[PDB]
Design a protein around this ligand. Structure first.
Ligand SMILES: Cc1[nH]c2ccccc2c1CC(=O)N[C@@H](Cc1ccccc1)C(=O)N(C)c1ccccc1
Ligand SMILES: Cc1[nH]c2ccccc2c1CC(=O)N[C@@H](Cc1ccccc1)C(=O)N(C)c1ccccc1
Ligand SMILES: Cc1[nH]c2ccccc2c1CC(=O)N[C@@H](Cc1ccccc1)C(=O)N(C)c1ccccc1
Ligand SMILES: Cc1[nH]c2ccccc2c1CC(=O)N[C@@H](Cc1ccccc1)C(=O)N(C)c1ccccc1
Ligand SMILES: Cc1[nH]c2ccccc2c1CC(=O)N[C@@H](Cc1ccccc1)C(=O)N(C)c1ccccc1
Ligand SMILES: Cc1[nH]c2ccccc2c1CC(=O)N[C@@H](Cc1ccccc1)C(=O)N(C)c1ccccc1
Ligand SMILES: [Cl-]
Ligand SMILES: [Cl-]
Ligand SMILES: [Cl-]
Ligand SMILES: [Cl-]
Ligand SMILES: [Cl-]
Ligand SMILES: [Cl-]
Ligand SMILES: [Cl-]
Ligand SMILES: [Cl-]
Ligand SMILES: [Cl-]
Ligand SMILES: [Cl-]
Ligand SMILES: [Cl-]
Ligand SMILES: [Cl-]
Ligand SMILES: [Cl-]
Ligand SMILES: [Cl-]
Ligand SMILES: [Cl-]
Ligand SMILES: [Cl-]
Ligand SMILES: [Cl-]
Ligand SMILES: [Cl-]
Ligand SMILES: [Cl-]
Ligand SMILES: [Cl-]
Ligand SMILES: [Cl-]
Ligand SMILES: [Cl-]
Ligand SMILES: [Cl-]
Ligand SMILES: [Cl-]
Ligand SMILES: [Cl-]
Ligand SMILES: [Cl-]
Ligand SMILES: [Cl-]
Ligand SMILES: [Cl-]
Ligand SMILES: [Cl-]
Ligand SMILES: [Cl-]
Ligand SMILES: [Cl-]
Ligand SMILES: [Cl-]
Ligand SMILES: [Cl-]
Ligand SMILES: [Cl-]
Ligand SMILES: [Cl-]
Ligand SMILES: [Cl-]
Ligand SMILES: [Cl-]
Ligand SMILES: [Cl-]
Ligand SMILES: [Cl-]
Ligand SMILES: [Cl-]
Ligand SMILES: [Cl-]
Ligand SMILES: [Cl-]
Ligand SMILES: [Cl-]
Ligand SMILES: [Cl-]
Ligand SMILES: [Cl-]
Ligand SMILES: [Cl-]
Ligand SMILES: [Cl-]
Ligand SMILES: [Cl-]
Ligand SMILES: [Cl-]
Ligand SMILES: [Cl-]
Ligand SMILES: [Cl-]
Ligand SMILES: [Cl-]
Ligand SMILES: [Cl-]
Ligand SMILES: [Cl-]
Lengths: 215, 215, 215, 215, 215, 215
């Protein structure tokens, strides 16, 4: 990473990433952990992290297709200019330079370090996180429409399932807000559903959980 | 975190937090450990810590509702002023800027680092700890009124149960002082209760435990 | 801690403390380990360490009663003066300021860092260690008067038991010196007791253990 | 390594390398991990890493034959000049000097540190990674022509196998692009093969996996 | 420790020491490990290390008796002078000041740090290592006179036993040299004894082990 | 070690060394690991590492005999000069000063640090590695003349055995080159032996292993 001078990615950081992928597969929390293990990383470092994954190769191919798309959008949105690079400047970074394919570690340290800086590590990380989100959507087992409280399921476990499935869903904040605003009370079991309908449309989750607590 | 320059949150700190949540669920000691693992953290770091939790999603939703309330109270209590930000200054932080939603890492490092500083990491941490306290109250099994010494329970185990349940209770220092002042002696078993009533209302816990030791 | 600038307490230091309390309960060695894990700590750090303990709540209540007593003795022994604090100075620390209750981390770093310094971390640590000693006395199973060598117990195991129980006892160096000077030889089994009585009152433990070695 | 001054390779880095070779044998991910554990390494450090491997001696001999070839190509491509080395300069590095055989640690730190620098650590690492790639090709069990989807195999597992075997293959990006462009759809089972043939030759892997998802 | 400014002893160093005592008891290698974990330590640090030992209290009492003797020899050999300590100087350290009993951490950092320095940490460590050697002698099971090669024992195992027991013995280099010079060949089994007697009195251990290898 | 100022050897480095000796006994890879854990070490550090080994005492005695020989060769090759050491200089190091016997840590830091420097740590390490090589030769079970491919042994396992045994052999690069040049093809089983004899005397190990792959 870069912290300002450049460090190598640590054996502990990399190892941590590997163990995360092995254990948690592609659960949502994988992405923050990644974003934490990859904080201040260069495209070489990120490439190292993705490469360290054995197995899960289908997902990885999806991810590099996403990276390809974002790199091409970068290229069309940033047309390269022809001409000799001045002494005090650096060349213009292509989409492949953001993904670490056609760029050296010194060039990455250059763009991140030299002034008027381009944060290629954070741009590449953004693309990677896009692909990862698409993957978590891909491998999510459930859909929020199918989370229904059981007749003998305590309210709390039903809310755990509900907001896990909701974390996994592909929707804007307004659509998720609508799903909370509608399905949670709608798809509780008859008893808790009557209690919550008696609370009103403006009660907080704390009040709803305390209300259906003994139930 | 920030220690003055900015570090990334370490794989060991994050991993420690994750293991704490897995093992201890939402016991009181979770909150100090958090406050220790999150010492000097940015809202991005705190967001990373909360995001790293798989499962327990109901509690997390409660927590972000708490964060929403505290952010809105901040917003009404700090009305934003319209006008162009001067060169030597920074913009005014909204409630969403405290929670890391609408603010960049460089803006957080700005408010914490630049002089006349606003400790947004400690404010956000305060809100988070508020929500966590509400959660520990939520998931506490017992109430202090129900801790009664058993006929064959040694005094020490009864005091362990009593002050654990008392740690979990939602009450001011004066109400807790009253609970110690009344229920502990009141709800001991008849033998120890007679001994402690013989000691008087001004004896220390050391003297009470030494008195009912052989009992 | 503070090492001069202020660090946060590490996940490894805290975790180590927690494991010590879990495994060794309240054995004497707990207190040095504490004093080692808490070296150069602030009252916030010490509070974090005590708070990280789940269970053992009776002992913790005893400990905060001890802290209360030492804080009140500090308060009566250091009467606060009324008047406006000058620019180049800091306020006077109360007993509650030593225990981290009514003081900020910056105020603690102030008293420890600013010149004419008050080591509030070492004072608070002294109070805590007082309470811990009282606890180790509380939970010690044995009394030094009851350590008697068995008929078939090797001398070395008897000395191990003897000086463990002696480590746990509440007595000045002169009283412990008397206990060594009397009970160790007095309460050995008849054979070793006759050997040691034949050595004389001025022989060292090395000579006593070598004498009763084959026995 | 060198980070600018020279460090020793850490017990944790070396140990990590050893464990990687023990567990993962010669899977592709071994090479990135190596390239990560060996970041900024000297030829002495790399030699230490290769030497720390017990067993797998056939592969190691293959690797030092590769290193020999690359060193001889370096030697013929860089003919050494006869004459006394000036005070302000260093000698010219042979192929054996790149591999750490005939060069001291101070000479390596010289070439990497002194200006007009020669990155002998990265050149040697390049040769080593060449040999490692040849080894991974050697020990790969399968060939991409033999990955055929089973009648009851979900599409995702078939893509995992396919792009693992494809990661192990020895082919340029254009040949791999052709293999993706042809065999993946060609060698799916009849059902998924008909679905994918119905999608068209321009569909992305995400669309193909979503299409054959329920299948 | 002190490395120049003062560090606290690390949780890892202390924990390592504890585990060493638990596992290896009082084997010779305990003393180097100690001397390595205690490198550059203050008497407070060393006291922490000895205090962290639970159990083995007989040995510890022997050790503090040794420390007492060495402190008294220091006191008689360094008579304290009466008079007011000058501003630019420090007081004279007693034997109890070397053992950390009657001296503050700042006074130890003073003697070790301030010029014309007294290395009280290395003196105290010397005394401690004296006591530890006396303990290893105490708990050694065997005597070098009793190591005799078995009729079917390979020569190498007999030499392992011999030089382990010889490591544990209390003797000068000349007495140990005599023991090697005599007993090793003398107390081998008849076959190897005849071979070694045929080699001569000037053969090295390598030659002796190669000679009795097949035997 | 020394990295320029002097560090203590770490608990992790030492512990790593101990575990290496426990697990791998005296396999070849022990020596690089040593040379890596001992990088930049002082004779005190190296002495600590050798001392930390429990058991294996025969080998250790062989090693200190080797160290004695190399020290005596140093002494005869470096005759000490009589006369008072000038202020700006240091004394001349004996062979015993290289091995840490008759020299202080400050004298070692002097020779390594002060200019016109003598690297006594690397000289002592050279002697130690000499003894270690002699030991690995001592405890090697096999001889390269006895590695013969089995009738049903795959070629790769036979090459693993062959170059392991070859790593353990005591021979110059030319003798090892002859052993590769002759015995490997000579001592394969009849089938692979005929294939390899058909390849020719100039084929690489890669080609030989690919040739006898299916066999
Ligand atoms: C962790 C989680 N669960 C969800 C369910 C549905 C939709 C999204 C999610 C998420 C990700 C998620 O929302 N993570 C939160 C951090 C967080 C985690 C846990 C509790 C409180 C705050 C986050 O990244 N931000 C910016 C945020 C912070 C405060 C309030 C609102 C949002
Ligand atoms: C740990 C604990 N147990 C309780 C029972 C009832 C109510 C609250 C609690 C707590 C939290 C709790 O009170 N923690 C203590 C620290 C502490 C922990 C353990 C022993 C002594 C001091 C704390 O945060 N402060 C500021 C404090 C310090 C000294 C005296 C009084 C309070
Ligand atoms: C560890 C221990 N065992 C005891 C038995 C009875 C009374 C007290 C104790 C103690 C605590 C104990 O005495 N610890 C010792 C350190 C120590 C530990 C072990 C061996 C030698 C020195 C200590 O803190 N100091 C200041 C000390 C140092 C040297 C001599 C005498 C005292
Ligand atoms: C990891 C992997 N799987 C393959 C299958 C066939 C051929 C090669 C490979 C590889 C190595 C592989 O291609 N690793 C990638 C990094 C990577 C890994 C995983 C997902 C996305 C990006 C890499 O090194 N670079 C330079 C790269 C980066 C972005 C897009 C394309 C290439
Ligand atoms: C480890 C050991 N085994 C013994 C048997 C009998 C008497 C003493 C011992 C020792 C302690 C022992 O002798 N340790 C050695 C270090 C050492 C350890 C192992 C092999 C070579 C060198 C030591 O401290 N010094 C100063 C030393 C160094 C080189 C040659 C001779 C002595
Ligand atoms: C590891 C090993 N196996 C052997 C078999 C027979 C004789 C010696 C050995 C060795 C030690 C061995 O040769 N280690 C190699 C490093 C190495 C290890 C593994 C693969 C490639 C390079 C080494 O130290 N040097 C200086 C070296 C480097 C490149 C080419 C040739 C030699
Ligand atoms: Cl690391
Ligand atoms: Cl690691
Ligand atoms: Cl998944
Ligand atoms: Cl790769
Ligand atoms: Cl940009
Ligand atoms: Cl951008
Ligand atoms: Cl679910
Ligand atoms: Cl949407
Ligand atoms: Cl509920
Ligand atoms: Cl880390
Ligand atoms: Cl970790
Ligand atoms: Cl809980
Ligand atoms: Cl998230
Ligand atoms: Cl503020
Ligand atoms: Cl505020
Ligand atoms: Cl309870
Ligand atoms: Cl209240
Ligand atoms: Cl009790
Ligand atoms: Cl840490
Ligand atoms: Cl940890
Ligand atoms: Cl206890
Ligand atoms: Cl608390
Ligand atoms: Cl004071
Ligand atoms: Cl004071
Ligand atoms: Cl006992
Ligand atoms: Cl007393
Ligand atoms: Cl005994
Ligand atoms: Cl390390
Ligand atoms: Cl390690
Ligand atoms: Cl393999
Ligand atoms: Cl080697
Ligand atoms: Cl070059
Ligand atoms: Cl080059
Ligand atoms: Cl496969
Ligand atoms: Cl090709
Ligand atoms: Cl699928
Ligand atoms: Cl640590
Ligand atoms: Cl630890
Ligand atoms: Cl022992
Ligand atoms: Cl103590
Ligand atoms: Cl001195
Ligand atoms: Cl001295
Ligand atoms: Cl024995
Ligand atoms: Cl002697
Ligand atoms: Cl033998
Ligand atoms: Cl360490
Ligand atoms: Cl360790
Ligand atoms: Cl061996
Ligand atoms: Cl020793
Ligand atoms: Cl030299
Ligand atoms: Cl030399
Ligand atoms: Cl073999
Ligand atoms: Cl030879
Ligand atoms: Cl083969």
């Amino acid at each position: 990473p870069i912290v300002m001078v450049h460090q190598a990615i640590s054996p502990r950081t990399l190892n941590a990433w590997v163990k995360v992928v092995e254990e948690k597969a592609f659960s949502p929390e994988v992405i923050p952990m990644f974003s934490a293990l990859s904080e201040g990383a260069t495209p070489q470092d990120l490439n190292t992290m993705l490469n360290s994954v054995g197995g899960h190769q289908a997902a990885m191919q999806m991810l590099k297709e996403t990276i390809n798309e974002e790199a091409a959008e970068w290229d069309r949105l940033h047309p390269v200019h022809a001409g000799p690079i001045a002494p005090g400047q650096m060349r213009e970074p292509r989409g492949s330079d953001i993904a670490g394919i056609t760029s050296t570690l010194q060039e990455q340290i250059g763009w991140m370090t030299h002034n008027a800086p381009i944060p290629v590590g954070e741009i590449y990380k953004r693309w990677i996180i896009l692909g990862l989100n698409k993957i978590v959507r891909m491998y999510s087992p459930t859909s929020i429409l199918d989370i229904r409280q059981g007749p003998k399921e305590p309210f709390r476990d039903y809310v755990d399932r509900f907001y896990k499935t909701l974390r996994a869903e592909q929707a804007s904040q307004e659509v998720k807000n609508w799903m909370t605003e509608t399905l949670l009370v709608q798809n509780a079991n008859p008893d808790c559903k009557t209690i919550l309908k008696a609370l009103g449309p403006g009660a907080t989750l704390e009040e709803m959980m305390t209300a259906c607590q003994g139930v």
